[PDB]
Amino acid sequence: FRIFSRFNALFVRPHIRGAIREYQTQLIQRVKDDIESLHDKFKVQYPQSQACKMSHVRDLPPVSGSIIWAKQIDRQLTAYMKRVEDVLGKGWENHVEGQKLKQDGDSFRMKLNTQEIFDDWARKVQQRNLGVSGRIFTIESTRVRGRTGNVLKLKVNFLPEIITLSKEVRNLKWLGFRVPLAIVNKAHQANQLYPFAISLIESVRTYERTCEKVEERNTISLLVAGLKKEVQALIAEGIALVWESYKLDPYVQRLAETVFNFQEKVDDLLIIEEKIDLEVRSLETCMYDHKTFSEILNRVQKAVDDLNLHSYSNLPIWVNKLDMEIERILGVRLQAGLR
Amino acid sequence: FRIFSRFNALFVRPHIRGAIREYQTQLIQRVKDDIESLHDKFKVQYPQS
Amino acid sequence: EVEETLKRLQSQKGVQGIIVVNTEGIPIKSTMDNPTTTQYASLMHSFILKARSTVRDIDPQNDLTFLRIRSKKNEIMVAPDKDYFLIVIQNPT
Amino acid sequence: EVEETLKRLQSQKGVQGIIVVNTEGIPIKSTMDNPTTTQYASLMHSFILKARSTVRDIDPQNDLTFLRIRSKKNEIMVAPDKDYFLIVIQNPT
Amino acid sequence: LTEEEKQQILHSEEFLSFFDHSTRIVERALSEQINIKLSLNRQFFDERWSKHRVVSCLDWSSQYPELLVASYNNNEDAPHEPDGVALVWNMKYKKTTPEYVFHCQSAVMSATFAKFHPNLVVGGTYSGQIVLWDNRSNKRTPVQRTPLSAAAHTHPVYCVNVVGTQNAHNLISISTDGKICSWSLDMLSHPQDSMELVHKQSKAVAVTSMSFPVGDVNNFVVGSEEGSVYTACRHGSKAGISEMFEGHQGPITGIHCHAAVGAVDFSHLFVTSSFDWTVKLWTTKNNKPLYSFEDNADYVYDVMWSPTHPALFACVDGMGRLDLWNLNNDTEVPTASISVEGNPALNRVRWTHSGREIAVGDSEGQIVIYDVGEQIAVPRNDEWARFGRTLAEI
Amino acid sequence: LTEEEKQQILHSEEFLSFFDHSTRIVERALSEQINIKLSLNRQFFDERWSKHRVVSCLDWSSQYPELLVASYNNNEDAPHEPDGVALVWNMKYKKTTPEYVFHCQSAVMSATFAKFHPNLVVGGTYSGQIVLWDNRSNKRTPVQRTPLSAAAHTHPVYCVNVVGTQNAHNLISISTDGKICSWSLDMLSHPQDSMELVHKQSKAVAVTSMSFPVGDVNNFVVGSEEGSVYTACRHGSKAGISEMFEGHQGPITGIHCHAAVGAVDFSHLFVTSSFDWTVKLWTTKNNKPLYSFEDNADYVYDVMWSPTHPALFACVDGMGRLDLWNLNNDTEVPTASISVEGNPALNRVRWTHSGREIAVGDSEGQIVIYDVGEQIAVPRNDEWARFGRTLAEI
């Protein structure tokens, strides 16, 4: 076909047409073999092919991926038939081989229909009745493994897979397939409300993770209590809200920044607390000498002052109990030295 | 100097001659007072040059 | 990390034995046995101290950051900077 | 040929001909400043002999012909055959 | 005899420089100096970090023309193990192990080097959060991460780039939603610019890949999964979509602008690798594609210009073969072709800096790098002239 | 033991194993890898020895390219303060004072480094006596002083230099009277060879400039105060002026032969600097000045070739601007030209022997060290061919 594309000048003159009609049967047989190979490749189903895997990697949902893949296969088949029509000329179907080839192509195209899967997907979407309306976030009861009590794990009233439906609808609109207007409205609402919901869920996950990190080290929870108090107050303010409102964006923004500040203060307190605990443990076994004790105490007080200037929460009792522990350790070292 | 030195043998043409210095005589005046500023150095420098 | 480092340094050539020596000789770690590791690593530490003196003799600010010995029967590797003395036992090839 | 070895060794980067040090600690060949090369040749002989003793402690059948004494300024290629110790000053890059 | 001092100095992790130099020198020590047309050169397949793993992105370090960054999405083999896998690979000496490794809590989609700093590496993930990592430091966690907010990216990001010089740099990223956002390498916690790209009637463009004219900042060119190519001015006199192209019927997967610069200006030539084996080429001044690539069907992924040759590029097919395409000698058949062994689902290719070799990605994680013919790598002024005259053919 | 038996043991034929060992270690050690615009460059301005005291001449040391000799001649602020001071200024380290300070009883106005002695400075003064300065001695007075006899120079002297091989040197010095004389660098008590330059009978030459061609010492070019350049043969039957040149109607304020080598010879070319801003890129073979670059109301004070670039050279100007003319780039505008602050009368320019930096004189004594861009400093292989083509233009 490329060789012919090099030379198409006197095809109007029925002199070179004898040569092309001499090999016309070879052309038809080879094109038939090509379309048979393409159909064999098609017979490998979309989920059974790596095309579905890559499209999932390419953010293309499997339903739309299969639909568009069949569409492009049909487009390539149409390109093949129109190119054969162009190269051979008008009325190749008049030949018995030509009409047989066109019948095979039409049968394959009938087997290559695509709207049925679109209708099935739309029917399934309508039947399941996807929705996000309700509460801003949901609280549930779960008995997590390892603990006898019923943990009231906090979740977000938002299905992560709804955006997949929204992107499916977005793809289908330019694909020429029309979905019911209710589905259009639902997908549009989910798409526009997605950033707020994902921000909410990431913020709540981060706050949870850091609060379990805090309670992992019980020596820090008393200091961190105030920040947890404001976080709980913000959660209490936000939970009463219905899923959709006009104050959603400012509330999500302030909650996210509050959670980020809470987490960063948590990690700063954690590192300074491990530092001070390490210094205390070193002083526990420190050799009997007024000097080294004095520098250790000076560094301890410097860390305490660094915490104080940061304007953290609930310091004085923490300082008092640190003094209690350090005076007990001092008494132990003093009895050792005295004996 | 060099910008019309690009022309040199160009304004010998009947139209190139008419396209040159008939639109730039004001710039001939400008180069003249440039020369005025040039001899401004000459004006008062003799023993303090 | 410790175990991952030893595993990746060993599996790169199927090295017969490597231990991490972050102290000045006399390591308690072992890779095939205590003696052949510890005494040979201490001897390596002494010899690399001598080599550091040798390289400081020409100019004191010089330090030996890389050292390898490839003889007819064994290959020995060590990359000391301040206390990180490496040991590698390997075929000459 | 001696001259062939000279021209082959000087082709290497940062190498001025070829200089060889004997067991007495002096270079049999003269290529650079005599006192510095003689003192550092005594030093290489000292620590290569101690390395020979070190390896013979556990490997009494090995022979030494390769050593990579590299610093942040240069690499030194010291290679003894039996008596003629081959030494090459080479840039690390 | 110490029993705890060595134990505690091993427990204490002051091995940053230690491990750094050990890794940089032991692979060098792997050298065996014991005294007693297309052609594959080096095949890389990390068993630990690429076992049944699809390469998500590929890039070449301009500052260090020996370093590569490889990206991976979440691993279906095991969700518990780290999902976002980022790989750094080097050619200083042959070695199976990668030079560096990196992990992101979300699936990594795109990643690239930084032009502003020769060590920092930036990567786009599936959560739409750009990820910063420092190569010099030995850490696995992301160094910096942009906040997940409405102003910032929220949909998965598939193309991140740094524009400008090393003193007027600007990190530009595009989300699949259509948000364009500019950051700086110093701070990655706030978008310096943010604006949701729109073509018309306030509908956004689902951008898949983006490209920019070589040697030019602003006036960006984007590709959409919708099957259309768009020219979008970054700031100009008006931000947003500046041109609607006819495009290709299938989705546009790989879009790239011409990069070779010589005696003629060919920076306006655009090549787009669509889903239908069709690499469509044209110029920004023409609304129609100038030529079409047709030898098979079903997804040639991406098209990448050769930095040195003006009329030569590469494009890898999902079927499992890489065909080298040159315009000066041919316009209907590939000038060179080769298929990776096993016929794997070859994903993506990336032209190295200064050319002379190509890097190929794969769905199995076994990336292959190899050179090209010396008779075909080097261009000449004749190549530029004949490319110019072949562009005038139609 | 001693260095005699080593010779026989080397001649002894047990060296096959040694040669095999050497070959093996060399072949194994062959592989080597890695482990991991015009600008004001610097300043030089004394205060005790440079209060006014205009700069007269400068030079760079061939053996020590980091060393520059300055010469300040006029003394008018105070009769009691030193008349002629010679200052040497170093490049390796930045100091507010010259590395060494030298005084002459008269006004030192021409100075140069010594090639044979790497620790000696020789200079010419207004009285006409050749002034020595051995840096080994701690005394500021001149070490050796030539007599003020008719045999030696008795008029002001401007061109002093040492040339020839390391084992054959001659201290060529010429005064305003037109007399040439050579000296041994170790003995200057008597003129070893001297004769006055004179053209056609009863016509003396008011010498003010000279420059030996690169390599040649037997013949050279002399710049006269009467604006007429001449070529003279240092030694031979035709020792004396050999060329009448029209030159320019202004006195010559500097001269220099070509200072580049590596491609087709250009040493026959030379640069002359007149008193009316008329520099003449021009060869000794021709009698007509090849070009007559003209601009400005002021005029040059010196012109120096590039030691590495066969086309670039520097120019002086009276209102404080220094310009570079790269002939291959252009012949009508200076390639680079900037003005130093205070618009002072620059008097001396001396290219560094490396050619990567250029020094300039001053009307107040503040020596300004200027660095140039890399693209403008280093020439290319095609630079010589382009220079030849430009010369062939007219």
In a 13 Å sphere around the CA of F89, the CA atoms on its Cβ side amount to 26
Its CATH class, for the domain covering D1-93, is alpha beta
Tokens, residue A315: 């310091």
CB spacing of D55 vs C69 below 8 angstroms: yes
Q: Which amino acid is at F172?
A: I
Residues of F whose CB is below 8 A from D93: 32, 34
CB spacing of B38 vs F297 below 8 angstroms: yes
**Which of F134, F133, F177 has its CA nearest to residue F157?**
F177
The answer to whether A224 touches A313, Cβ cutoff 8 Å, is: yes
Residues of F whose CB is below 8 A from E35: 24-25, 28
Instruction: List E residues 74-93 in contact with F (Cβ-Cβ < 8 A).
Output: 92-93
The answer to whether C76 touches C89, Cβ cutoff 8 Å, is: yes
Output the CA angle F172-F157-F266, nearest 5 degrees. 50
In angstroms, what separates the C-alpha of E367 from chain D's closest C-alpha?
29
The residue in chain E having the minimum alpha-carbon distance to the alpha carbon of residue C26 is E1
Diameter of chain D by CA atoms? 39
The answer to whether A68 touches A175, Cβ cutoff 8 Å, is: yes
Q: Note every long-range contact of A160-163, with CB atoms under 8 Å and residues 24 or more positions apart, other chains counting.
A: A160/A198, A160/A201, A162/A130, A162/A132, A162/A190, A162/A194, A163/A190, A163/A191, A163/A194
Q: Which helix (H) or strand (E) holds F392?
A: helix F381-393
- F52 — contact with chain E (CB < 8 Å)? no
Output the CA angle F2-F8-F14, nearest 5 degrees. 120
The answer to whether D24 touches C10, Cβ cutoff 8 Å, is: no
Tell me the C-alpha distance between A187 and A66, whole Å: 20
The residue in chain C having the minimum alpha-carbon distance to the alpha carbon of residue D59 is C73
In a 13 Å sphere around the CA of D91, the CA atoms on its Cβ side amount to 7
Tell me the C-alpha distance between D15 and D77, whole Å: 11
3 state SS of F9: helix
The residue ranges of DSSP E strands in E191-347, in sequence order, are 193-196, 198-200, 203-204, 207-211, 220-224, 229-233, 240-244, 252-257, 269-274, 279-283, 300-305, 312-317, 322-326, 336-338
**Starting from the edge strand earliest in sequence, which strands make up the sheet with F100-104, in order?**
F55-60, F67-72, F84-90, F100-104
The answer to whether E6 touches C22, Cβ cutoff 8 Å, is: yes
Tell me the C-alpha distance between D1 and F283, whole Å: 52
The answer to whether D27 touches F44, Cβ cutoff 8 Å, is: no
In angstroms, what separates the C-alpha of F308 from chain D's closest C-alpha?
25
Tell me the C-alpha distance between F87 and F141, whole Å: 13
CB-nearest to F25 from D82, D86, D93 is: D86
How is chain D split into domains, by residue range?
1-93
**Which of F347, F338, F356 has its CA nearest to residue F300?**
F347
F76 φ/ψ angles, rounded to the nearest 5 degrees: -130, -20
CA-based torsion, E66, E67, E72, E78: positive or negative: positive
Per residue in E277-288, is it b (16+ CB within 10 Å) or e — as a string?
bbbbbbbbeeee
Tokens, residue D5: 């070895």
CB spacing of F297 vs B41 below 8 angstroms: yes
| Method by which the model was determined | cryo-EM
Which ranges in F236-358 belong to alpha helices (H)?
none
Per the DSSP assignment, residues forming a β-bridge with F324 are F314, F336
Tell me the C-alpha distance between A195 and A158, whole Å: 11
Contacts of A43 (CB under 8 A, 6+ apart): none
**Which of F207, F199, F202, F311 has its CA nearest to residue F253?**
F207
Under DSSP, the state recorded for F190 is S
Residues of E whose CB is below 8 A from C65: 21
In angstroms, what separates the C-alpha of D86 from chain E's closest C-alpha?
14
Count of CB atoms situated within 10 Å of the CB of A291: 7
How many residues does the structure list for chain D? Answer: 93
The answer to whether A203 touches A256, Cβ cutoff 8 Å, is: yes
Task: Report CA dihedral (E274, E277, E282, E286) to the nearest 10 degrees.
Answer: -70
**Which of C71, C72, C77 has its CA nearest to residue C89?**
C77
3 state SS of E352: coil
CB spacing of D51 vs C47 below 8 angstroms: yes
In a 13 Å sphere around the CA of F260, the CA atoms on its Cβ side amount to 24
Tell me the C-alpha distance between F22 and E251, whole Å: 64
Contacts of A163 (CB under 8 A, 6+ apart): A190, A191, A194
Tokens, residue F13: 């034929």
Count of CB atoms situated within 10 Å of the CB of C25: 17
Tell me the C-alpha distance between A31 and D31, whole Å: 79
Tell me the C-alpha distance between E254 and E211, whole Å: 9
In angstroms, what separates the C-alpha of D93 from chain F's closest C-alpha?
5
The answer to whether E307 touches E267, Cβ cutoff 8 Å, is: no
Count of CB atoms situated within 10 Å of the CB of A131: 12
Q: Which helix (H) or strand (E) holds E85?
A: strand E84-90
Contacts of C81 (CB under 8 A, 6+ apart): C63, C65, E17, E18, E21
In angstroms, what separates the C-alpha of E34 from chain C's closest C-alpha?
5
CB spacing of C69 vs D69 below 8 angstroms: no
Resolution in A: 5.0
Burial class (CB in 10 A: 0-12, 13-18, 19+), A72: buried
The answer to whether C71 touches D59, Cβ cutoff 8 Å, is: yes
Tell me the C-alpha distance between D23 and D42, whole Å: 9
- Give how far Cα E107 sits from Cα of A127, C26, E137, Å: 32, 45, 22
The secondary structure of F38-86 as a DSSP string is EEEEEEE--SSS-SS--EEEEEE-SS-TTEEEEEE----S-SSS-SEEE
Burial class (CB in 10 A: 0-12, 13-18, 19+), F340: middle
- Interface with D, mutate which of F32, F33, F35, F36 (most D CBs under 10 A): F32
- The backbone region for A129, taken as left when phi is positive above 0, alpha when psi lies in -120 to 50, beta otherwise, is left
| Residue owning tokens 């080397």 | F10
Residues of B whose CB is below 8 A from F332: 2
Tokens, residue F258: 């070509």
Tell me the C-alpha distance between E220 and E233, whole Å: 5
